[PDB]
Design a protein around this ligand. Structure first.
Ligand SMILES: *[C@@H]1O[C@H](CO)[C@@H](O[C@@H]2O[C@H](CO)[C@@H](O[C@@H]3O[C@H](CO[C@H]4O[C@H](CO)[C@@H](O)[C@H](O)[C@@H]4O)[C@@H](O)[C@H](O[C@H]4O[C@H](CO)[C@@H](O)[C@H](O)[C@@H]4O)[C@@H]3O)[C@H](O)[C@H]2NC(C)=O)[C@H](O)[C@H]1NC(C)=O
Ligand SMILES: *[C@@H]1O[C@H](CO)[C@@H](O[C@@H]2O[C@H](CO)[C@@H](O[C@@H]3O[C@H](CO)[C@@H](O)[C@H](O)[C@@H]3O)[C@H](O)[C@H]2NC(C)=O)[C@H](O)[C@H]1NC(C)=O
Ligand SMILES: *[C@@H]1O[C@H](CO)[C@@H](O[C@@H]2O[C@H](CO)[C@@H](O[C@@H]3O[C@H](CO)[C@@H](O)[C@H](O)[C@@H]3O)[C@H](O)[C@H]2NC(C)=O)[C@H](O)[C@H]1NC(C)=O
Ligand SMILES: *[C@@H]1O[C@H](CO)[C@@H](O[C@@H]2O[C@H](CO)[C@@H](O[C@@H]3O[C@H](CO)[C@@H](O)[C@H](O)[C@@H]3O)[C@H](O)[C@H]2NC(C)=O)[C@H](O)[C@H]1NC(C)=O
Ligand SMILES: *[C@@H]1O[C@H](CO)[C@@H](O[C@@H]2O[C@H](CO)[C@@H](O[C@@H]3O[C@H](CO)[C@@H](O)[C@H](O)[C@@H]3O)[C@H](O)[C@H]2NC(C)=O)[C@H](O)[C@H]1NC(C)=O
Ligand SMILES: *[C@@H]1O[C@H](CO)[C@@H](O[C@@H]2O[C@H](CO)[C@@H](O[C@@H]3O[C@H](CO)[C@@H](O)[C@H](O)[C@@H]3O)[C@H](O)[C@H]2NC(C)=O)[C@H](O)[C@H]1NC(C)=O
Ligand SMILES: *[C@@H]1O[C@H](CO)[C@@H](O[C@@H]2O[C@H](CO)[C@@H](O[C@@H]3O[C@H](CO)[C@@H](O)[C@H](O)[C@@H]3O)[C@H](O)[C@H]2NC(C)=O)[C@H](O)[C@H]1NC(C)=O
Ligand SMILES: *[C@@H]1O[C@H](CO)[C@@H](O[C@@H]2O[C@H](CO)[C@@H](O[C@@H]3O[C@H](CO)[C@@H](O)[C@H](O)[C@@H]3O)[C@H](O)[C@H]2NC(C)=O)[C@H](O)[C@H]1NC(C)=O
Ligand SMILES: *[C@@H]1O[C@H](CO)[C@@H](O[C@@H]2O[C@H](CO)[C@@H](O[C@@H]3O[C@H](CO)[C@@H](O)[C@H](O)[C@@H]3O)[C@H](O)[C@H]2NC(C)=O)[C@H](O)[C@H]1NC(C)=O
Ligand SMILES: *[C@@H]1O[C@H](CO)[C@@H](O[C@@H]2O[C@H](CO)[C@@H](O)[C@H](O)[C@H]2NC(C)=O)[C@H](O)[C@H]1NC(C)=O
Ligand SMILES: *[C@@H]1O[C@H](CO)[C@@H](O[C@@H]2O[C@H](CO)[C@@H](O)[C@H](O)[C@H]2NC(C)=O)[C@H](O)[C@H]1NC(C)=O
Ligand SMILES: *[C@@H]1O[C@H](CO)[C@@H](O[C@@H]2O[C@H](CO)[C@@H](O)[C@H](O)[C@H]2NC(C)=O)[C@H](O)[C@H]1NC(C)=O
Ligand SMILES: *[C@@H]1O[C@H](CO)[C@@H](O[C@@H]2O[C@H](CO)[C@@H](O)[C@H](O)[C@H]2NC(C)=O)[C@H](O)[C@H]1NC(C)=O
Ligand SMILES: *[C@@H]1O[C@H](CO)[C@@H](O[C@@H]2O[C@H](CO)[C@@H](O)[C@H](O)[C@H]2NC(C)=O)[C@H](O)[C@H]1NC(C)=O
Ligand SMILES: *[C@@H]1O[C@H](CO)[C@@H](O[C@@H]2O[C@H](CO)[C@@H](O)[C@H](O)[C@H]2NC(C)=O)[C@H](O)[C@H]1NC(C)=O
Ligand SMILES: *[C@@H]1O[C@H](CO)[C@@H](O)[C@H](O)[C@H]1NC(C)=O
Ligand SMILES: *[C@@H]1O[C@H](CO)[C@@H](O)[C@H](O)[C@H]1NC(C)=O
Ligand SMILES: *[C@@H]1O[C@H](CO)[C@@H](O)[C@H](O)[C@H]1NC(C)=O
Lengths: 132, 438, 43
């Protein structure tokens, strides 16, 4: 069922995952459509910042070997120190906003391993499987 | 065991400021602006709650400075009135004897430089005594000439407030609470979101708020700090209070070619119903609404206190009286006729005397000034009073309140409190039972 | 200070200056360095 932009924002993370694309589209949006003038360089600046805003994180997903995004798995195990809750305590009983409230503390820390571990090791390995 | 799983398109956001841009339909300053959608979208968000804070909402700051920028840009390509700064030879104007009008204008004459830079021309024009001042018939001076230069507003451009919509760029969301209750800040049980804001007219006024939005339920009292009388109070009405203001002067525009090339619009002659401009207010309506306001006040000060209303502390006319624009003309009205009452412990119509100025200073800004051209013919208009800008004045019962203003960011804030801007963060991660194979 | 070690270097110049009252002018004065000004053609 089509809910609308951010229509699942007020639901559990499990439920919300159903309709990530409805949001995804408008993360970059597009369209929009005497010189200078007020707004003359503001629509300019804003529309630019939108593009940068998008790609800055998209590239990270490019690095984190997935690309086929919205959702993908890794080979990095979850450290229990990063909010030790059960799946039903998390996915079936918590919104994404509530999630960030806690996990945001380890953002860069987790990014470390995502930015690396697998990306490093998945490769070489393959290069070696190509030996024969 | 659980693993790190990567998610994208996550419905989360952080409070953040970015560069907003306008939209409005397809006069004032708006043309270079993206047309609005024929179907503005929205969506109520269920289970979503969070805090608002109108007192730190930087949307106001941007809007304020943007409007200022627009103002200047609309004047640069217009005619400068630099050579008007000359000694004026002025005399009283014999209005219908004896003297009810008090003159208020002088039949000034002066040697003016014309298109023929060389031979000058003795001309005349009617000026308000609020615009000119005696030097040292008698000699007079345009008041602006002691502070800065003055520019004539183009006769083609208008000042009619036009509904403007604000939009955020992709990655940013416009959040809008629909909660009819709001203290000025805190959590809202009922939050929605929109593509863009509703049309807001850039109405400049002091003391009284005009042509704004209406409140639901009861009268709304909002203040950064009610107990702190160094702050002020925003009052939003529930029902439009009609005010009808008139300038009964079918006057002409003896335009004078003080070139070269560029033309000046002087004041011709004043004929017709020589009465002072004034405003008409429905008295019973005012009394009724004021009472509703006092009810609120009772609710934040006690069920055994006394409420008195009075005029300002005086001083700068711009703050002392109610200033507003109608059709290009600038009015200054004595709101003592409104703000003069009291309430205990637990037609009819009102006439408000007004004055007309032609030299004005916007947004408390010094260093420049703008000359309003006289508008030909009788000028009369009507608007909706939709709120008050009040200030809080042996402190155990009787309290006195009075009208203020000055800082016009207050006006924008009186509307934008319904909105806030947040930055979406699409990228998130979470623990999920999944080990990824090659 | 007599006699003359400073060599002057500045002149006590005066002139009919246009003021805010574009019309009646005002005789004023100002000290200028002789590196800034040059004789035309007191002088
Ligand atoms: C503030 O300015 C506004 C305009 O901006 C003025 O608005 C007027 O307000 C009054 C009160 O609401 C309106 O008067 C009422 O109009 C009714 C209809 O009038 C028109 O239609 C009739 C036929 O139906 C014509 O005869 C008439 O010429 C109009 O064309 C009348 O039906 C009403 O009459 C009844 O009430 C009056 C008393 O108010 C009685 O005398 C009658 O006998 C009868 O019982 C009434 O006149 C008026 O129409 C509004 N004008 C407009 C433009 O909408 C406010 O008056 C003004 N306030 C100030 C202080 O000036
Ligand atoms: C908004 O939050 C409310 C809770 O505050 C969520 O309410 C849940 O709504 C659904 C739909 O009405 C209910 O699900 C239905 O429950 C019955 C019985 O359990 C089951 O037979 C149906 O198959 C269905 O699941 C759910 O019980 C109800 N929860 C509670 C606490 O009453 C709603 O889901 C929230 N919306 C968002 C987008 O998260
Ligand atoms: C511009 O208007 C001014 C008045 O606002 C006119 O001023 C007049 O200027 C002349 C020249 O300076 C004055 O004339 C001289 O007066 C003295 C004494 O009366 C007399 O001795 C001289 O022979 C000579 O006439 C005149 O008095 C002065 N008027 C006043 C009111 O001060 C000026 O003429 C105007 N210019 C134009 C083009 O009309
Ligand atoms: C305001 O001052 C102006 C001058 O700055 C006065 O202008 C005078 O206005 C009257 C009416 O337009 C003119 O009178 C008419 O002149 C013609 C020709 O001389 C004559 O045929 C008519 O019988 C009539 O008198 C008068 O000439 C004009 N003066 C000039 C200098 O143009 C006006 O009177 C002043 N108003 C006040 C209340 O004093
Ligand atoms: C709302 O703003 C008002 C004023 O802007 C704040 O009032 C201030 O409240 C404190 C606590 O009652 C007063 O501090 C006390 O003052 C006495 C004398 O100066 C001193 O002896 C104490 O050590 C203490 O500092 C303060 O004077 C009072 N200010 C005024 C103008 O009366 C109130 O705190 C504000 N509320 C919010 C939430 O910030
Ligand atoms: C608002 O209305 C009040 C009256 O309700 C006006 O009060 C007047 O305020 C001025 C300034 O404080 C007082 O003027 C001063 O009076 C003393 C003595 O007469 C004199 O020595 C000073 O030179 C000066 O004029 C005035 O007396 C006071 N009136 C009364 C009745 O107390 C105030 O002017 C009003 N504001 C507006 C914008 O009209
Ligand atoms: C706004 O309108 C009010 C009337 O609605 C005007 O009130 C007048 O205010 C002045 C200053 O408070 C009063 O003048 C003082 O009166 C006493 C006694 O007559 C005299 O002793 C003082 O020397 C001084 O003149 C005046 O009486 C008062 N008028 C009435 C009807 O109470 C006020 O002037 C208005 N403001 C504007 C800008 O016109
Ligand atoms: C501005 O300063 C200049 C000097 O730097 C003043 O010049 C004076 O101008 C008047 C008018 O051109 C001259 O007066 C005429 O002189 C002749 C001969 O002395 C006499 O025949 C006439 O009756 C008349 O007085 C005057 O000589 C000249 N001074 C010099 C030094 O050349 C001018 O007056 C100043 N303006 C202001 C407003 O003070
Ligand atoms: C530089 O030239 C200026 C004029 O451009 C000369 O100005 C003169 O300065 C003196 C000292 O400030 C003034 O003298 C005083 O005048 C008052 C009133 O006349 C008198 O009460 C005092 O006893 C004293 O004399 C003089 O008036 C002023 N002149 C003018 C035109 O304002 C200054 O003297 C020049 N310096 C050199 C080294 O020549
Ligand atoms: C999970 O990450 C935490 C840090 O977030 C690691 O914590 C270390 O734990 C050991 C054992 O208690 C201590 O010696 C270290 O000093 C802790 N580090 C800090 C920052 O407190 C823990 O090692 C991590 N587990 C995995 C498997 O790497
Ligand atoms: C113009 O008329 C005004 C009155 O409308 C006169 O005002 C007088 O001005 C003098 C100087 O300021 C005061 O001494 C008087 O008290 C003022 N009268 C009043 C009623 O306030 C002024 O004199 C008039 N000018 C002409 C040339 O007659
Ligand atoms: C610039 O002119 C204004 C008047 O146009 C002068 O304002 C006066 O300022 C003093 C001091 O604040 C007040 O006593 C007067 O009441 C003011 N007059 C008015 C009309 O408000 C100001 O003094 C002038 N500046 C210069 C340098 O002369
Ligand atoms: C004054 O505000 C009132 C709202 O209280 C406006 O009322 C609208 O009036 C027109 C004409 O009768 C109707 O078409 C609308 O449906 C009314 N709105 C509602 C909420 O009832 C009126 O437009 C306002 N006037 C000004 C000049 O804006
Ligand atoms: C002031 O007194 C009034 C009654 O005169 C109180 O009114 C109550 O207000 C609350 C909030 O609106 C309602 O829940 C009650 O039902 C009202 N009572 C009645 C009689 O209507 C109000 O509580 C009083 N304020 C103070 C501080 O005590
Ligand atoms: C303030 O408004 C009151 C009415 O609310 C005015 O009261 C008048 O006051 C004078 C002096 O006491 C009396 O002559 C009148 O009869 C009073 N009117 C009534 C309705 O009682 C008072 O004039 C107002 N003040 C201002 C400055 O306008
Ligand atoms: C994990 O959930 C189980 C029930 O599924 C519960 O027994 C245990 O308490 C939970 N974890 C936490 C930290 O309590
Ligand atoms: C995250 O840690 C910061 C201090 O680094 C702290 O202020 C905040 O409370 C922490 N959040 C969690 C959920 O403990
Ligand atoms: C306003 O009406 C209230 C009663 O609702 C009354 O107490 C007060 O006297 C009224 N004011 C006017 C001017 O009649």
């Amino acid at each position: 069922v089509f809910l609308g932009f951010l229509g699942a924002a007020g639901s559990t993370m499990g439920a919300a995952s159903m309709t990530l694309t409805v949001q995804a589209r408008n993360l970059l949006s597009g369209i929009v459509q005497l010189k200078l003038t007020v707004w003359g360089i503001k629509q300019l600046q804003a529309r630019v910042l939108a593009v940068e805003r998008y790609l800055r994180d998209q590239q990270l997903l490019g690095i984190w070997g997935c690309s086929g995004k919205l959702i993908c798995c890794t080979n990095v195990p979850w450290n229990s120190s990063w909010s030790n809750r059960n799946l039903s305590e998390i996915w079936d009983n918590m919104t994404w906003l509530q999630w960030d409230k806690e996990i945001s503390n380890y953002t860069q820390i987790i990014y470390g391993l995502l930015e690396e571990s697998q990306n490093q090791q998945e490769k070489n390995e393959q290069d070696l499987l190509a030996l024969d | 065991n659980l693993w790190v799983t990567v998610y994208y398109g996550v419905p989360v956001w952080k409070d953040a400021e970015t560069t907003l841009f306008c939209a409005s339909d397809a006069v004032w300053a708006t043309h270079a602006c993206v047309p609005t959608d024929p179907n503005p979208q929205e969506i109520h968000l269920e289970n979503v709650t969070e805090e608002f804070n109108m007192w730190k909402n930087n949307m106001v700051e941007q809007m304020h400075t943007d409007i200022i920028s627009l103002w200047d840009q609309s004047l640069k390509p217009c005619v400068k009135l630099t050579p008007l700064c000359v000694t004026l030879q002025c005399t009283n104007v014999t209005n219908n004897i004896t003297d009810d009008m008090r003159g208020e204008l002088k039949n000034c004459s002066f040697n003016m430089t014309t298109e023929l830079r060389d031979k000058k021309q003795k001309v005349y024009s009617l000026f308000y005594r609020l615009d000119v001042v005696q030097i040292n018939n008698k000699e007079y001076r345009l008041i602006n000439c002691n502070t800065s230069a003055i520019t004539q507003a183009c006769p083609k451009v208008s000042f009619e407030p036009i509904p403007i919509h604000y939009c955020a760029p992709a990655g940013f969301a416009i959040l809008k609470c629909k909660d009819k209750k709001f203290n000025g800040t805190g959590p809202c049980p009922s939050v929605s979101t929109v593509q863009c804001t509703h049309g807001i007219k850039p109405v400049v006024s002091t003391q009284l708020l005009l042509n704004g939005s209406l409140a639901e339920e009861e009268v709304m009292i909002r203040s950064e700090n009610i107990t702190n009388n160094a702050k002020n109070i925003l009052v939003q009405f529930n029902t439009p209070v009609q005010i009808n203001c008139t300038r009964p002067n079918n006057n002409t525009r003896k335009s004078i070619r003080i070139g070269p090339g560029q033309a000046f619009y002087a004041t011709g002659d004043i004929i017709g119903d020589i009465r002072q401009a004034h405003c008409n207010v429905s008295k019973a309506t005012w009394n009724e609404t004021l009472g509703k306001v006092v009810k609120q006040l009772r609710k934040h000060f006690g069920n055994n206190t006394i409420i008195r209303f009075a005029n300002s502390s005086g001083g700068d006319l711009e703050v002392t009286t109610h200033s507003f624009n109608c059709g290009g003309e600038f009015f200054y009205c004595n709101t003592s006729g409104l703000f003069n009452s009291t309430w205990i412990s637990n037609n009819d119509s009102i006439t408000l005397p007004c004055r007309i100025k032609q030299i004005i200073n916007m947004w408390q800004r010094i260093g420049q000034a703008m000359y309003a051209p006289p508008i030909q013919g009788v000028i009369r208009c009507v608007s909706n009073i939709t709120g008050l800008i009040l200030t809080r004045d042996t402190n155990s019962t009787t309290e006195t309140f009075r009208p203020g203003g000055g800082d016009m960011r207050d006006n924008w804030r009186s509307e934008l409190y319904k909105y806030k801007v947040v930055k979406i963060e699409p990228l998130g991660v979470a623990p999920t039972r999944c080990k990824r194979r090659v």
